[PDB]
Structures are given as structure tokens and as C-alpha cells.
Design an enzyme around this catalytic site. Structure first.
Site, PDB file in Angstrom:
ATOM      1  N   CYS A 120       3.538   1.727   9.411  1.00  0.00           N
ATOM      2  CA  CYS A 120       3.393   0.568   8.492  1.00  0.00           C
ATOM      3  C   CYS A 120       4.788   0.079   8.047  1.00  0.00           C
ATOM      4  O   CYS A 120       5.709   0.881   7.945  1.00  0.00           O
ATOM      5  CB  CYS A 120       2.425   0.904   7.364  1.00  0.00           C
ATOM      6  N   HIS A 140       0.860  -1.220   0.000  1.00  0.00           N
ATOM      7  CA  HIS A 140       0.000   0.000   0.000  1.00  0.00           C
ATOM      8  C   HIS A 140       0.886   1.257   0.000  1.00  0.00           C
ATOM      9  O   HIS A 140       0.330   2.387  -0.105  1.00  0.00           O
ATOM     10  CB  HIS A 140      -1.058  -0.040   1.112  1.00  0.00           C
ATOM     11  N   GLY A 184       2.617   6.276   9.604  1.00  0.00           N
ATOM     12  CA  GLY A 184       4.061   6.171   9.329  1.00  0.00           C
ATOM     13  C   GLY A 184       4.669   4.887   9.888  1.00  0.00           C
ATOM     14  O   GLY A 184       5.848   4.627   9.561  1.00  0.00           O
TER      15      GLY A 184
END
Ligand SMILES: OC[C@H]1CN(Cc2ccccc2)CCO1
Ligand SMILES: OC[C@H]1CN(Cc2ccccc2)CCO1
Lengths: 304, 304
Positions: free
Chosen positions: B145, B41, B143
Site C-alpha cells: 500500500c 488506512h 506492505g
């Protein structure tokens, strides 16, 4: 979102841990520049530990009696001195992994991470608070002495704790990196009782702010109180007194949530008086006191 | 003595964390050998996130669109592929700090440490369990991920988790390092509800053993039970069923404490039925389920 009991990344401290052996005693040392710091009781037989005279025990010891191993390589000890309850072993090699560091003496209520080590090898990291009675509630087996407590500000490790002692009650006592015990404790196998283990009120308030921030709001009440009224209730429940210094430190959390500190105090008061009625806050059934206001801001803001 | 929620030393994983930027999205990557692993993503605008077609989005992307930074040095991306929900970015430099590692898919109930990172920089480490509904209760801001979950067996890091998603309920979802989600979750900004968050029974039993070992014994009762009788009570209290596999795994703790597993089951049963009556076990007011039997043995034995 979510709120966790979170330790500092331990890598910078892993790089500092060595094994120290004097005769048949092995424990952990901290290697910073060309000095290895360890508990002076390294020189004791657990027989010596009943009534040690460290100055007299030390006379019997030479540089070559201190065996320092970093990984599976031996460091050469070219000097040793006693500073309070720690030995400083001067080695011939500067630790190439020395991070920027400070030695700081923390106050009761302040939180730090512990890198638990055996034979100079890291086993785990956890987050602690210095209790108001200057104990910590650690996880420390035989061989864990010389394990250290630390905070990190960006790239600078502040070393605040070195593990020395388990009290007969299974709570822990240690020194700053100058070898001065936190609280009235001594490195001797004798009856040493801790004082009252009171709750760190300012930390509970911070963690109630963290809960609000993270959506746990069931406990927010319609009341306010005063520092004096709150403190009467605090004392009754073995909570430490809240000062205007604590109120000031909570200012930013007050600002972000729009909950005045004295309002959150009145919410805490009702939880003390009414209990949790089987409910939880941030997945805890009791009021957590091992997050500082700084810790709540750090974790809620994502500092690295 | 003492028992702490303890993470693995994070140093070996700190050495693997990089920043990955695609357009205006920055998150974390794991750099192992000459591959950087990150959530796919990374290629999405939070607009894309409503109904992303990753294969179609990826067509628009070249090696040079993936910006990989390790410290303040840029890595050259010489290839990229999608494997399930992760991107593998081939870089021209092998990570010189690559530890021995494995990718493992863990089962619900298994515990791991999370190194929470922002912009490829570590902020903290905490201990998690994979919940029976294949969520984790993390601490993850925007932030975070590409932050990873891991176990360490001596010198080998087993990577089990990569952070992808926060569900609308503020619980967390992610993948193994092959990019396969734990549970039924997808990397799309849509209504995704978790199933029942049940208690990991075998973990509670392990932690009751840890409590006995550490001197907290007030809850040991005079009763025993059967797996079938216990399981009837378990289901009523949203506890996962206990199998003979769980009983076998608790064998060593049973052996050390001399408390038969089914006796400790009957003690757990009474705690469920009677509650804690305002008492604590290992400083918790509720029954802790984020220690495995392996975790209790490790911490109680001092493994490094
Ligand atoms: O009644 C007031 C509270 C706070 N206590 C002060 C206190 C201060 C330092 C260390 C331990 C204890 C006493 C006992 O309960
Ligand atoms: O009544 C029995 C318990 C266990 N539960 C099984 C379960 C299994 C996997 C994931 C979530 C939930 C259902 C709800 O409560």
C-alpha cells in the site's frame, strides 16, 4: 495477490547510461567507475558492417574520436581498448552514481530486465529471458545498441547483456559485459539464422506454481508422470528437457503449494496435449516461460 | 523491431519512496517536496479496517505518531492532514530528489507504470491499465500500500495512482494523489464487487497496429465495417464501445500503416468471431489491451 511480468527498478542503471558517438554513429554506453562499455560496431559505417575488420578499423581511431556525453556534459576519453565485441573507453571521471556491480554470463532460460535507451537516455524497462537459442525477443529500434540487461540482488547490479544486433527475423543478439556473444552470433550484417525457439520448461512450471499460489487452479489434473515420460512429451512440443536440477530448483514452490513437481509436470503435459480450450492462466492464453523459479519466489514473497 | 510491455524508467520515482509507520502498520509513502503522501488506512488496525471512522481515528494521532524513514534516516513530521483517502504528512526536509511532477486523474483504458514497494523499498516495476471498471490487475502483497502509478513526459512524472486495496476477487483499487478512489471503492474491509471487466477496444486496435508495424500481419482481412456495426459485435464480446474520439486518436497509426481504422476494426471483428485458431500476435494468444495508441507510437518511435 496478482502476478505481473515485473522488471527490476531501473534507477541504479539509469545512472550508468551515456551517449557514445564515433563519427556519424551514435549509440549507448554503460559508465561504471572510469570505464564506458559500448558495442565495438560504434566504429562502423553501416557499409563497414557488411564485413568489418574491427582491429583494422580501430587503428584509424584515437581517444578524441570517441565522444562520450553523460547528461549534457562531455567526458574526457584518456584510453580505449577492444575486449571481444565491446569497447572499453577509459574516461578521466569515475561515474559518481556507480552502483555495486558484477558482470555475469547468464545461461539460456535466465530472465533479466532491459533498460531500453536512445542517445544515452532511458525510454523504458521490460523483463526478458535469454532464449534456449541464445536470442532474446526485445524491443530495440536504431540507436538502442549498448542498452543493457541486468538483475539486482538488493544493492548489487549484475550486468548480463549488452544489445548489439537485430537478426533478419527481428529477434535480438548481444554480448555479456566481456564482449562475448550469447550463442553463435557475430557483429556483422550477414545472414545469421537462430536455432529452434523452444519453451523454457522449468520457467513454465514455476509460472504454473505462481498461478496456483494466486488462485488459478482449473488446470490442476489428477495425474502424475516421470521425468522420462514428461521429457518424451516435452521434446514433441519443442519444450526443453527437464533435469533433476530443474526439479530441485522448483522444490520450494512444490513445498509451499503441496503440489509435487512431477504432478505439476503431468498437469503441464495435459495442457500441451489438450490445449487451453479457450481458458486463460494468470490472464495468458499461452504458457508463459519468462519467469524463473527464483522470479516466482521473489515476486510471491515481496523481496526488495 | 519487436514490441514489449514496457514500463517507464522508475529512477525518478524510486527517489520519492519512503516508509510510513503508524503504530504497528507499515506501508509506503511518496515524498515530494516537504510532503509525504500515503493511504490514510495507515492509522488502522486490520480490526479498525472493518468499519473505520478515519476522522475519529485521526483525533488519536499526533505528528510524532507518524514515523517516516527515507533510506535509514528518519524525517521529522511537523504537520499532517487528511485529503479524501490520503494523508499528507508535512516534513521539515524537502526531498532533494523531487522530480518535476503533476498529479493527474486518468480515465479507464489509460496505462501507467507501477513501482511496487515494501517498507519504502522498490521491488519491481510493471505496466498496468486502469480497467473500464476502475480496478487494476496488479501484483501487490501486504506492505505494498502507498506504491504509486505514474507516466513520464520527458522529465515530468505524472502521478496517477496510489495503491490502497485488494478486493476479495484479488483485483486492486486505489486513489489518485488527491485521495479520490478510482471507481466506487472505499478503504473499508467490506464486500466490494467490481463491474464487468470489459476489453479496452481502442488499446486492442493500437496493439494490432503495433503488430502490423512489427511484421505480424496474418490477421489482416479483406473486410471493412462501420462504427455502428463494429460496436454491435464489440458489446456482444464485452469490448468497450469505439467512439470517433478513439478513431481520431488512432489516426497516426492508420497513416503510418496505410490501414484505415475501420478496416482494422473489421480485422478485430473477425478475430472475435473466428478466434486465433491457435495462432499468436506479437507472441500473445489473446488480444492485448494494455497499450494505448500513445504507447504504441512512443515505443514504435523510441521516445526518451
Ligand atoms: O526436440 C527437442 C526440443 C529441444 N531442442 C533443443 C534445443 C536446445 C538448444 C537450443 C535450441 C533447441 C530442440 C528442438 O526441440
Ligand atoms: O455490453 C457492453 C459491454 C461494455 N460494458 C460497459 C462497461 C462500462 C464500464 C465499466 C464496465 C462495463 C458493459 C458490458 O459489456
Amino acid at each position: 495477490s496478482g502476478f505481473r511480468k515485473m522488471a527490476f527498478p531501473s534507477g541504479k542503471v539509469e545512472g550508468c547510461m551515456v551517449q557514445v558517438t564515433c563519427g556519424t554513429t551514435t549509440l549507448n554506453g554503460l559508465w561504471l567507475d572510469d570505464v564506458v562499455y559500448c558495442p565495438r560496431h560504434v566504429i562502423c559505417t553501416s557499409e563497414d558492417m557488411l564485413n568489418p575488420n574491427y582491429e583494422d578499423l580501430l587503428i584509424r581511431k584515437s581517444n578524441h574520436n570517441f565522444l562520450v556525453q553523460a547528461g549534457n556534459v562531455q567526458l574526457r576519453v584518456i584510453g580505449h581498448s577492444m575486449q571481444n565485441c565491446v569497447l572499453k573507453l577509459k574516461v578521466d571521471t569515475a561515474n559518481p552514481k556507480t552502483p555495486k556491480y558484477k558482470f555475469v554470463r547468464i545461461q539460456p532460460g535466465q530472465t533479466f530486465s532491459v533498460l531500453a535507451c536512445y542517445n544515452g537516455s532511458p525510454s523504458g524497462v521490460y523483463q526478458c529471458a535469454m532464449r534456449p537459442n541464445f536470442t532474446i525477443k526485445g524491443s530495440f529500434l536504431n540507436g538502442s545498441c549498448g542498452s543493457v540487461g541486468f538483475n539486482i540482488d538488493y544493492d548489487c547490479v549484475s550486468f548480463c547483456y549488452m544489445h548489439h544486433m537485430e537478426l533478419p527475423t527481428g529477434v535480438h543478439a548481444g554480448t555479456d559485459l566481456e564482449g562475448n556473444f550469447y550463442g553463435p552470433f557475430v557483429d556483422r550484417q550477414t545472414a545469421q539464422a537462430a536455432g529452434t525457439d523452444t519453451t523454457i520448461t522449468v520457467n513454465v512450471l514455476a509460472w504454473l506454481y505462481a498461478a496456483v499460489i494466486n488462485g488459478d487452479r482449473w488446470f490442476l489434473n489428477r495425474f502424475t508422470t516421470t521425468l522420462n515420460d514428461f521429457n518424451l512429451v516435452a521434446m514433441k512440443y519443442n519444450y526443453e528437457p527437464l533435469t533433476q536440477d530443474h526439479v530441485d530448483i522448483l522444490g520450494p514452490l512444490s513445498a509451499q503449494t503441496g503440489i509435487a513437481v512431477l504432478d505439476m509436470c503431468a498437469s503441464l503435459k495435459e495442457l500441451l496435449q489438450n490445449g487451453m480450450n479457450g481458458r486463460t492462466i494468470l490472464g495468458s492464453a499461452l504458457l508463459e516461460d519468462e519467469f524463473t523459479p527464483f522470479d516466482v519466489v521473489r515476486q510471491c514473497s515481496g523481496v526488495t
